[PDB]
């Protein structure tokens, strides 16, 4: 149920060893608007793979 000794800051760090975030590997650039975006997502302007897909 509960700890019998206080785990160390060492043990806590070793547990958090796997808590690291992963940066997005690389952003794509829309071929028309030229702006960066996630792979397979539309750009913030509403571009995807060149064509304007949503009116702003």
């Amino acid at each position: 149920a509960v700890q019998q000794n206080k785990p160390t800051r060492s043990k806590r760090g070793m547990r958090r060893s796997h808590d690291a975030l992963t940066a997005v590997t690389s952003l794509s650039v829309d071929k028309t608007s030229g702006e960066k975006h996630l792979r397979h997502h539309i750009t913030a302007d509403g571009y995807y793979r060149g064509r304007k897909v949503i009116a702003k």
Binding site: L38, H40, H41, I42, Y48, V53, I54
Partner: protein, 119 residues
Amino acid sequence: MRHRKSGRQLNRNSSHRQAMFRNMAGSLVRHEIIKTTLPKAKELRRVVEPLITLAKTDSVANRRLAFARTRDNEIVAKLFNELGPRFASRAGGYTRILKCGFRAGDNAPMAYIELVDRS
């Protein structure tokens, strides 16, 4: 397990899923593009596209089936008078999923689902 099973539960019961997908299919027919979560858009393909397939051939029986599936007369009218004829030659795939990031409130992966011949 889940071998070869189809259909997302979406953390709802069956009646809620059916009702929600009626509302969302009606919204998509009405507006021709909606923003919703990516899993719901993927599941909405299988509700909306059969309706367009049904609407390609106009008969009283097909109108009534579409009205049973959608329970909205103006949605049925738009289907059978616009999208059936608009999609007559298109062999399926009447919608398009466009991923659009994440909601602020819950970080849900969002997507636009639109009719293919909208713009």
